[PDB]
Structures are given as structure tokens and as C-alpha cells.
Ligand binder design. Structure first.
Ligand SMILES: *[C@@H]1O[C@H](CO)[C@@H](O)[C@H](O)[C@H]1NC(C)=O
Ligand SMILES: *[C@@H]1O[C@H](CO)[C@@H](O)[C@H](O)[C@H]1NC(C)=O
Ligand SMILES: *[C@@H]1O[C@H](CO)[C@@H](O)[C@H](O)[C@H]1NC(C)=O
Ligand SMILES: *[C@@H]1O[C@H](CO)[C@@H](O)[C@H](O)[C@H]1NC(C)=O
Ligand SMILES: *[C@@H]1O[C@H](CO)[C@@H](O)[C@H](O)[C@H]1NC(C)=O
Ligand SMILES: *[C@@H]1O[C@H](CO)[C@@H](O)[C@H](O)[C@H]1NC(C)=O
Lengths: 166, 49, 199
């Protein structure tokens, strides 16, 4: 070995990594991906082991120093301990529901008002009630007999130029 | 409403047609602080082979 | 000799947290009111688990020995507390017939009751524990919090003991009913096959 030969006789260092695999837990593994944390949005998470979709929010449950998950009476995931900073989050399924088209007689008018059931419609003139939130209906402080029942004591009707009142 | 009722006129009432569903914004992944990396700097950077 | 383990030997079977809810889980547990082979040294079998207990004063009980043939030509675990740290190996150190080499793992870090539990689930090691002060196995209830895990996959059938009193149980596949309190702590359990009232 001389430093002024050609490359042909010029020394080279060689390392041969022989990857062997048996029925083993196989701990020798590369780094996994890790994204930043976002709350209060219907996101599609995958914490350390488990996955799912929900709306992560900061919580106030107190896990035991070795526990990781949480579950309900019906065996559903409810809380996760964040593996990087150990703060417990909650998990709320981002909202869903049904769409219902209120109409007066078509004979009477072509105007309607929609009721999204059981949402806050802050992420979905615009009225929030106890049964959903009503879109396209005035609010009156009076009271009359029920014309079109809705739920939880709200009845809407068509009244005076005219419009729909609730 | 008309298309669900199979009618061109509908009498006064309340009817249910479709379904609401918020969609997932994005994905998120979390894992423990990756430390204790391989001492590959010990076999590649070694003194004597 | 023999004695009767009244109510002891319940370990959190998993990692979830449940608050004030009665749960029914099936796994390997020590049957209620069993016999424990009171001792005061020789090898023993490893049917499906153990309930090593002890009531020591000055750490007279040190460690353990595992393995199938318990010497060379087949691997064998080890655990010791040699006044420094819990040295763990899976080497084939010639096992002396009265104790007190090509290996593929390593690690280095009456008033006591060092209750322990050992399981070779999927051939890999699993340990629980609970270290309780006391002042001849007392009654009373206390759960076991897991503290270690070894991914070895060794084939274990027999074990031994190194060098007060200590006992030995054997886990069996029995269904229980666990009473998580509000904090998530196991507070009471009912054996689901002991007797008609329990059923
Ligand atoms: C209903 O429709 C008929 C014709 O289709 C019409 O003569 C009648 O006035 C309508 N009544 C109301 C209350 O709209
Ligand atoms: C709608 O959302 C806002 C912000 O998240 C919240 O402050 C408000 O209380 C919600 N509405 C209801 C009726 O809870
Ligand atoms: C187990 O315990 C019972 C009650 O203490 C005793 O009668 C019996 O001899 C013990 N051993 C066996 C093998 O049953
Ligand atoms: C493991 O090493 C020992 C000597 O330390 C040797 O006798 C044995 O053959 C080796 N095992 C294998 C599978 O090579
Ligand atoms: C251990 O031996 C049993 C039979 O005695 C066999 O079923 C099992 O696969 C063996 N495990 C290992 C890890 O060699
Ligand atoms: C629950 O945890 C709190 C927090 O330390 C503690 O003060 C309390 O004694 C524990 N047990 C109960 C039953 O509240």
C-alpha cells in the first residue's frame, strides 16, 4: 500500500452489513415520522399505536403514571396520552347528522328553511336553537299554537312581505 | 324534497332528505422522542480495521 | 409445606385507564385461595407463570435463574441484584448446582413484601411488581403495576432461585371481574368461578 499508486492497488475500507431476521421483536429499526400537534379540528390521527379520526382537545383526566389509553363503558377510545409531551387529550367524533327541508304548502310559497340537527353551525338569518340550528327563519318573542312542530318546544309557521317565523 | 317525495307538490310539513358529515381536515402522527440511535459512528469511524 | 394465598395476585392486565367501571377480563391469574409452596433454594417448574412473593428484612433474596436445560447448549436468562444494579443477561454462564458465552442480549441499570409476577407470553419476558411495607402471608388486596419487558423469545420451561421466606404460585387461565375505582386503580376483584355466589 503506497499513497502514490493508481486506484487499482489503492487501499479501500469495506463494511458489510449482514441483515439477519428471526422470530424476534426486531428492535433495531429506523426513526418513525412525527408531525406537529393541532387541536380543535376534525383531523385524522395515528397516535403511537392506534388510529382514528376526531377532534383533539386538551383534557383534565388523570391517568396512572403507566397507562396510555382511555375507554368508555361501551369500549370506545376516549383519551390518549401524548407520547412526546405527556398531556392527556380527549377525542370527540367530529359532528354529523341529518338534513331536513321544511316547506309550507308548495301551493302557498316556494320558500323553505333548513334545520341542521344537533350541530353548532359555527363551522358548518342563522339561528341556533335547542334542537339543531335553524337557517332562514325569523325569531319572534310572541307565542302561538303549534303549526309545524320541530322539537324541544319549538314550532315554526309562515307569517307576514311574508316570511317564516320560529 | 320533491325528489325524495316523488311528487311535484308537497304539503306543509317537515321532511328529512340527506345527511350532514364534517370531513377530516388533515392527518397527524405522533411518536416518542427518537433517541438512543445506533453507534454506527463507532464501526465506520473506527481506528483500525 | 403449604399455605393459603387469601386474596393476592391481581395485576393490571393491560394499559387502558377505566374510571369507576366494573370490567370482566380473562387472562392468567392466580386462583383465589390457592396453595403457595412456602419455602425457606431448589429449582422449580414454570408451568405458565409464577407468583413469587417474599417477606424479607435485609435483601437476603437476590435474584433468579431461568432456562430450559438450565446450562450450556441452550440459552438461559438471568437476573441479579449484586448491590449495584439489576444486571440482566441471556448468556450461557455454566449454572453451578449450588449458585449464590455467545449471548444475544444484555442490560445493566418483616417489613418488605416484594410481590412479583413473571410470564413468558409469546416466548418474551413480562414482569409486574408491587413493593409494599408490612409488619405468614397477610391478607389484604393490592394490584400489580408492570415495570419491565424483555423481547427475548427464549424457550423457558424451568427456573430456579438465588440467595426470610418466599412463596410460589402458578397462574391459571381464569376469568375475573375487576373493580376500577375513579382514579383507575384496581380496588377489588371477584373470581368468576370460585363458588356459586361468585358466579
Ligand atoms: C291550492 O291550489 C289550488 C290549485 O292547485 C288553488 O286553487 C288553491 O287556492 C290553493 N290553496 C292554497 C291554500 O294555496
Ligand atoms: C359554538 O362554538 C364556539 C366556539 O367553539 C363555542 O364558544 C360555543 O359555545 C359553541 N356553541 C354552543 C351552543 O355550544
Ligand atoms: C392444597 O390446599 C389444600 C387446603 O389447604 C390442602 O388440603 C391440600 O393438601 C393442598 N395440596 C394439594 C395438592 O391439594
Ligand atoms: C456459539 O458460540 C459457541 C462458542 O462460544 C460455539 O460453540 C457455537 O457453535 C456457536 N453457535 C453457533 C450457532 O454458531
Ligand atoms: C420450545 O419447545 C417447544 C416444544 O418443547 C416448541 O413448541 C417451541 O416452538 C420451542 N420454542 C423455541 C423458541 O424454541
Ligand atoms: C386519587 O388521586 C389524588 C391525587 O393525588 C389523591 O389525593 C387521592 O387520595 C386519590 N384517591 C382518591 C380515592 O381520591
Amino acid at each position: 500500500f503506497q499513497p502514490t499508486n493508481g486506484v487499482g492497488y489503492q487501499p479501500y475500507r469495506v463494511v458489510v452489513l449482514s441483515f439477519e431476521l428471526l422470530h424476534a421483536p426486531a428492535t433495531v429499526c429506523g426513526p418513525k415520522k412525527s408531525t406537529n400537534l393541532v387541536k380543535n379540528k376534525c383531523v385524522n390521527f395515528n397516535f403511537n399505536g392506534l388510529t382514528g379520526t376526531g377532534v383533539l382537545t386538551e383534557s383534565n383526566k388523570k391517568f396512572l403514571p403507566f397507562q396510555q389509553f382511555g375507554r368508555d363503558i361501551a369500549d370506545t377510545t376516549d383519551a390518549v396520552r401524548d407520547p412526546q409531551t405527556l398531556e392527556i387529550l380527549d377525542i370527540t367524533p367530529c359532528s354529523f347528522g341529518g338534513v331536513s327541508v321544511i316547506t309550507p304548502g308548495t301551493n302557498t310559497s316556494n320558500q323553505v328553511a333548513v334545520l341542521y340537527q344537533d350541530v353548532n353551525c359555527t363551522e358548518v338569518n342563522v339561528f341556533q336553537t335547542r334542537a339543531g340550528c335553524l337557517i332562514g327563519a325569523e325569531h319572534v318573542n310572541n307565542s302561538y299554537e303549534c303549526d309545524i312542530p320541530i322539537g324541544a318546544g319549538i314550532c315554526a309557521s309562515y307569517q307576514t312581505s311574508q316570511s317564516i317565523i320560529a | 324534497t320533491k325528489c325524495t317525495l316523488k311528487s311535484f307538490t308537497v304539503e306543509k310539513g317537515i321532511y328529512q332528505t340527506s345527511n350532514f358529515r364534517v370531513q377530516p381536515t388533515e392527518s397527524i402522527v405522533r411518536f416518542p422522542n427518537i433517541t438512543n440511535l445506533c453507534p454506527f459512528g463507532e464501526v465506520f469511524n473506527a481506528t483500525r480495521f | 409445606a403449604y399455605t393459603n394465598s387469601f386474596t393476592r395476585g391481581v395485576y393490571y392486565p393491560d394499559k387502558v385507564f377505566r374510571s369507576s367501571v366494573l370490567h370482566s377480563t380473562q387472562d392468567l391469574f392466580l386462583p383465589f385461595f390457592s396453595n403457595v409452596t412456602w419455602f425457606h433454594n431448589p429449582v422449580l417448574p414454570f408451568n405458565d407463570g409464577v407468583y413469587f412473593a417474599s417477606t424479607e428484612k435485609s435483601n437476603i433474596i437476590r435474584g433468579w435463574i431461568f432456562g430450559t436445560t438450565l446450562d450450556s447448549k441452550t440459552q438461559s436468562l438471568l437476573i441479579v441484584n449484586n448491590a449495584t444494579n439489576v444486571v440482566i443477561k441471556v448468556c450461557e454462564f455454566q449454572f453451578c448446582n449450588d449458585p449464590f458465552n455467545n449471548c444475544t442480549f444484555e442490560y445493566v441499570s418483616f417489613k418488605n413484601l416484594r410481590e412479583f409476577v413473571f410470564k413468558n407470553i409469546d416466548g418474551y419476558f413480562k414482569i409486574y411488581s408491587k413493593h409494599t411495607p408490612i409488619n405468614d402471608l397477610p391478607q389484604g388486596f393490592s394490584a400489580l403495576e408492570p415495570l419491565v419487558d424483555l423481547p427475548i423469545g427464549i424457550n423457558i420451561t424451568r427456573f430456579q432461585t438465588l440467595l426470610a421466606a418466599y412463596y410460589v404460585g402458578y397462574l391459571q387461565p381464569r376469568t375475573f371481574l375487576l373493580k376500577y375505582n375513579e382514579n383507575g386503580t384496581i380496588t377489588d376483584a371477584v373470581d368468576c368461578a370460585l363458588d356459586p355466589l361468585s358466579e
